[PDB]
Amino acid sequence: SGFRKMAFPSGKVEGCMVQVTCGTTTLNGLWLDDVVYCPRHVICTLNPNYEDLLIRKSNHNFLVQAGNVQLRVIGHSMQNCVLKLKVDTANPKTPKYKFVRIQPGQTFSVLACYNGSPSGVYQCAMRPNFTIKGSFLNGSCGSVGFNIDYDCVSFCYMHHMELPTGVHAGTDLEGNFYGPFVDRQTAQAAGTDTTITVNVLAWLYAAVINGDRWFLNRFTTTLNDFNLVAMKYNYEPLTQDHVDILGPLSAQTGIAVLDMCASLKELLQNGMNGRTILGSALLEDEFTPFDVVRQCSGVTFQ
Amino acid sequence: SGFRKMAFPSGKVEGCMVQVTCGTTTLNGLWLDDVVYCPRHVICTLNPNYEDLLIRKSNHNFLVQAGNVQLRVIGHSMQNCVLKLKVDTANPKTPKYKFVRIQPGQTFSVLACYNGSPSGVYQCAMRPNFTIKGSFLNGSCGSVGFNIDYDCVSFCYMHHMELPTGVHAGTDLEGNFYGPFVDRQTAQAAGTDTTITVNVLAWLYAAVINGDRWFLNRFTTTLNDFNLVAMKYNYEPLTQDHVDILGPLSAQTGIAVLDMCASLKELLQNGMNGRTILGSALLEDEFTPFDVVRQCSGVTFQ
Numbered sequence: 001s002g003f004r005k006m007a008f009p010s011g012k013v014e015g016c017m018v019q020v021t022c023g024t025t026t027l028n029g030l031w032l033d034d035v036v037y038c039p040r041h042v043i044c045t046l047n048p049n050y051e052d053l054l055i056r057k058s059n060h061n062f063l064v065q066a067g068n069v070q071l072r073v074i075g076h077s078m079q080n081c082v083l084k085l086k087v088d089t090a091n092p093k094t095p096k097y098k099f100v101r102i103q104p105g106q107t108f109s110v111l112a113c114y115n116g117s118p119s120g121v122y123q124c125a126m127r128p129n130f131t132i133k134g135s136f137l138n139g140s141c142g143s144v145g146f147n148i149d150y151d152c153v154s155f156c157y158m159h160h161m162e163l164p165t166g167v168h169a170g171t172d173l174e175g176n177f178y179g180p181f182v183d184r185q186t187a188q189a190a191g192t193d194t195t196i197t198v199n200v201l202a203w204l205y206a207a208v209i210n211g212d213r214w215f216l217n218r219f220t221t222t223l224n225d226f227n228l229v230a231m232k233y234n235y236e237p238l239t240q241d242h243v244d245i246l247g248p249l250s251a252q253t254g255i256a257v258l259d260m261c262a263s264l265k266e267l268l269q270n271g272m273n274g275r276t277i278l279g280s281a282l283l284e285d286e287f288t289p290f291d292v293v294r295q296c297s298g299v300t301f302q
Numbered sequence: 303s304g305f306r307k308m309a310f311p312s313g314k315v316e317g318c319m320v321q322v323t324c325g326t327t328t329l330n331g332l333w334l335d336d337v338v339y340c341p342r343h344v345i346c347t348l349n350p351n352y353e354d355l356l357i358r359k360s361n362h363n364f365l366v367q368a369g370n371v372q373l374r375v376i377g378h379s380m381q382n383c384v385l386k387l388k389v390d391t392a393n394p395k396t397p398k399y400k401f402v403r404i405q406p407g408q409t410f411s412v413l414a415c416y417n418g419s420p421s422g423v424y425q426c427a428m429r430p431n432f433t434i435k436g437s438f439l440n441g442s443c444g445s446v447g448f449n450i451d452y453d454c455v456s457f458c459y460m461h462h463m464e465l466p467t468g469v470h471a472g473t474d475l476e477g478n479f480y481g482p483f484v485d486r487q488t489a490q491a492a493g494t495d496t497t498i499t500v501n502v503l504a505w506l507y508a509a510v511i512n513g514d515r516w517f518l519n520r521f522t523t524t525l526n527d528f529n530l531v532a533m534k535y536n537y538e539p540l541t542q543d544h545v546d547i548l549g550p551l552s553a554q555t556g557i558a559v560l561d562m563c564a565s566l567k568e569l570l571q572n573g574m575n576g577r578t579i580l581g582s583a584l585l586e587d588e589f590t591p592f593d594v595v596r597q598c599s600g601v602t603f604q
């Protein structure tokens with residue numbers, strides 16, 4: 001028992017981090033086979049034209065350090081907002097991997113890195129407004145976010161920038177930003193966020209699995225009537241697809257999904273009355289149904 | 303900016319996990335050089351006498367799997383509550399490492415493991431009552447907890463057992479339990495816990511570093527008067543040593559330690575009034591002063 005903000009084991013990703021330096025700019029890169037992926041604003045020189053900035057660069061302008069070893073850059077290309085530096089050596093620690101673009105509400109592990117060296121690992125969710133509430137300092141750009149499926153690393157996030165509210169914006173590993181953000185230092189802001197309803201419900205099921213039941217009640221609700229209360233509290237709408245995903249958790253605990261919705265409704269309307277759930281005094285929304293199953297059941301990775 | 307429950311990168315420890323099987327019992331072991339460390343109750347056959355159970359075992363009774371490779375056991379010895387299995391092969395992925403016994407209030411990363419395969423990583427603190435609030439299922443015993451200092455892994459915890467309240471008990475890597483617990487399935491219970499005061503104060507300094515100030519006030523307090531209020535709310539006493547440790551954080555923010563104590567006092571006496579600090583509606587006590595400095599300043603590991 002117990003329930004924790006669990007990250008994936010990070011070793012497979014640690015073996016891929018490197019330092020990219022060009023001009024006076026240094027940041028992190030991701031070394032998979034003979035390519036290094038990094039944010040394109042590593043390149044020299046408000047509102048830049050990156051195609052024009054890149055044609056002016058030479059391969060030897062790029063200093064790539066992998067540990068105590070310099071890698072030689074033999075080609076480069078820009079894809080959206082990431083640079084791909086082709087190097088003369090394939091990374092021998094390259095795991096099995098995929099690049100995936102996730103939906104809002106999905107969670108992932110972040111390996112925070114400075115100068116190509118890993119600093120720490122933590123669990124994040126992609127918010128409905130396409131920011132992440134990360135922990136990132138200057139020099140962290142190029143750190144990646146990932147999931148691990150059995151033996152395969154699915155990279156889903158590369159960090160680029162921090163917004164005025166202290167939240168973070170970045171891209172998938174093919175360089176497409178999540179949300180409306182652009183990689184310029186022009187004024188931009190997050191957009192209003194909402195609570196990830198299907199995740200809050202998954203976390204309530206985790207609480208039941210772990211012996212917490214105090215928040216349950218005898219009522220039920222319709223999907224429609226639930227969504228009417230959800231709207232009022234800035235929760236995103238629950239769909240029939242969300243209901244179906246919560247299926248396994250509902251069957252394991254014997255609590256109908258709409259019955260758990262009735263419990264969430266009463267918690268929204270009444271507060272928690274000075275009581276906690278899984279060690280929290282807030283309704284937690286950064287665990288997916290998959291996260292709960294994986295941790296309350298014990299899936300590993302080879 | 304941002305502040306997260308950050309674990310250490312786990313790769314150096316992942317390379318040391320193995321599976322130990324003897325009889326019908328399988329659990330995790332830690333492979334450093336040519337020794338495998340695991341909990342001694344791996345051995346065959348309420349109230350066991352382990353010296354007597356161990357003399358009856360043979361080296362070939364122990365099946366140690368490291369990936370797809372069986373390691374051969376060529377000796378064994380018991381040290382307190384851990385077994386040490388000498389194997390014929392030194393682990394080539396052995397990091398630089400130390401074994402350390404930590405004090406209550408100290409934090410560490412836990413690499414949860416099943417059948418020798420890592421499942422997830424999370425951050426823990428040793429509670430004042432010498433339990434940890436982990437996330438552990440059947441088969442997790444032998445998973446380890448650790449800190450990383452630059453290049454060196456300091457192992458401080460090996461998991462053994464779960465207590466009726468859902469918290470966890472275990473040993474240092476030389477087999478000495480934290481707290482009064484014994485490795486038998488006789489009735490045992492945690493003992494009343496207290497809040498780690500110096501950690502709550504460190505976390506309030508983290509909130510200030512990240513732009514939260516709403517909980518500060520104009521008052522001050524004496525150490526003695528503070529401790530009188532702390533007692534009433536089940537907080538452990540703050541000592542002059544705690545005050546000195548909070549030194550660097552106090553100087554970086556310009557808030558005197560006893561001034562921050564006055565703020566904590568007012569938060570204890572008044573509640574948080576429906577407001578949050580660093581995304582929490584509770585006073586968080588599982589970040590040390592070191593944790594805060596490391597994350598708000600960006601220390602890495604090579």
Ligand SMILES: *CCC(=O)N(CCC(N)=O)NC(=O)[C@H](CC1CCCCC1)NC(=O)[C@@H](NC(=O)OCc1ccccc1)[C@@H](C)OC(C)(C)C
Nearest residue numbers: 041136137138139140141160161162183184185186187188
């Ligand atoms: C790559 C360097 C890096 O580590 N990093 C991550 C910073 C953190 N803490 O996560 N990224 C940056 O520092 C980027 C670098 C620029 C280079 C040019 C191309 C875009 C990225 N800058 C910022 O993160 C920057 N944000 C920003 O400019 O947002 C747009 C904006 C501008 C002006 C007013 C309002 C919004 C940060 C450093 O600026 C603050 C918002 C002031 C923190």
Ligand SMILES: *CCC(=O)N(CCC(N)=O)NC(=O)[C@H](CC1CCCCC1)NC(=O)[C@@H](NC(=O)OCc1ccccc1)[C@@H](C)OC(C)(C)C
Nearest residue numbers: 343438439440441442443462463464485486487488489490
């Ligand atoms: C090594 C197997 C393992 O994974 N593991 C971790 C369990 C979790 N979830 O963390 N450890 C155990 O399962 C141990 C195995 C025994 C073998 C004999 C020597 C001691 C350890 N058992 C327990 O964790 C057990 N606790 C326990 O017996 O506490 C003492 C006690 C007994 C009776 C009444 C009250 C306290 C668990 C499995 O028992 C529960 C407390 C019922 C959960």
